[PDB]
Write a protein that binds this DNA or RNA. Structure first.
Ligand code: MG
Ligand code: MG
Ligand code: MG
Ligand code: MG
Ligand code: MG
Ligand code: MG
Ligand code: MG
Ligand code: MG
Ligand code: MG
Length: 224
RNA sequence: GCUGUCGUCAGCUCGUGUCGUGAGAUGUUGGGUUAAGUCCCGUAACGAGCGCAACCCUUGUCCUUAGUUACCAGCACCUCG
């Protein structure tokens, strides 16, 4: 937005220059002190195009799955999940979540049953050597499946934050043929994603900006 | 049909998903721990079954129920059982 806040937060930065993908060469403005610099001129049109796509997809009661699992990055995804709804994941991505989704329906049902059982006035009124085990199993299931408790169907567009770190999700999203919105850094590969956002990673301010922009865009799209 | 043995050793597999042209692989590998594929943490795997364990019999402590053919603390007698 207006080239200033992005410059301030973290965007014009990359993953050194020893580690990089040649397919990113068209986005690099240059190198500064053995560190690559992202051309912020090219990223703004792509960012705005992603904004319009999310806004127009929101109008129609669809779902955007947010993938942000990373240190200090999945958390902000989780608190961004409140407001504008939409499913999310912030812990490890289970293998075959979008291709073996029929099986994971069963685990979601089990999570729902456990949540009903524990929070119906503490029905776990049995031996104390088993209530703790049941509660910790419930917490373990929650810690992975809580974000996607909703969305009985497949999402119509998957928003990822790091192509390389979460390549499994992008691969199976491509296999299912559903759009992918990704924030590609210098060391990652743009291949496999539809809309590319050549921005920085590993920056709390940057990811905060991206998630808040997504939230406001989807809110505007949802307002109709 | 019934039985021995490896061996009461902790192992043997399947559904869906993914990798390979294929036989196949992953799950079931890795760090710890346990009598145990026992458990935890991690992880293209998510789950489940047969096994392990518990549920059964006996032994050790105590409570309640009842005292005959069993028992004898208190009392009378005893021919002194
Ligand atoms: Mg097998
Ligand atoms: Mg199998
Ligand atoms: Mg298989
Ligand atoms: Mg094949
Ligand atoms: Mg084996
Ligand atoms: Mg095997
Ligand atoms: Mg091991
Ligand atoms: Mg077992
Ligand atoms: Mg047994």
């Amino acid at each position: 937005v207006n080239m200033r806040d992005m410059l301030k937060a973290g965007v014009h930065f990359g993953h050194q220059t020893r580690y990089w993908n040649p397919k990113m060469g068209k986005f690099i403005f240059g190198a500064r002190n053995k560190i690559h610099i992202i051309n912020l001129e090219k990223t703004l049109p792509m960012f705005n195009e992603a904004l319009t796509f999310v806004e127009r997809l929101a109008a129609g009661k669809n779902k955007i799955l947010f993938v942000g699992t990373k240190r200090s990055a999945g958390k902000i995804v989780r608190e961004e999940a409140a407001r504008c709804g939409m499913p999310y994941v912030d812990h490890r991505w289970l293998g075959g979540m979008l291709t073996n989704y029929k099986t994971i329906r069963q685990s979601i049902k089990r999570l729902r049953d456990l949540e009903t059982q524990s929070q119906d006035g503490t029905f776990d009124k049995l031996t104390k050597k088993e209530a703790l085990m049941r509660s910790r199993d419930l917490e373990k299931l929650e810690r992975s499946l809580g974000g996607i408790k909703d969305m009985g169907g497949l999402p119509d567009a998957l928003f990822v934050i790091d192509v390389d770190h979460e390549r499994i999700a992008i691969t199976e999203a491509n296999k299912l043929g559903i759009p992918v919105i990704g924030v590609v850094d210098t060391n990652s590969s743009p291949e496999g994603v539809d809309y590319v956002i050549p921005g920085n990673d590993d920056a709390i301010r940057a990811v905060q900006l991206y998630l808040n922009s997504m939230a406001e865009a989807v809110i505007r799209g949802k307002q109709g």
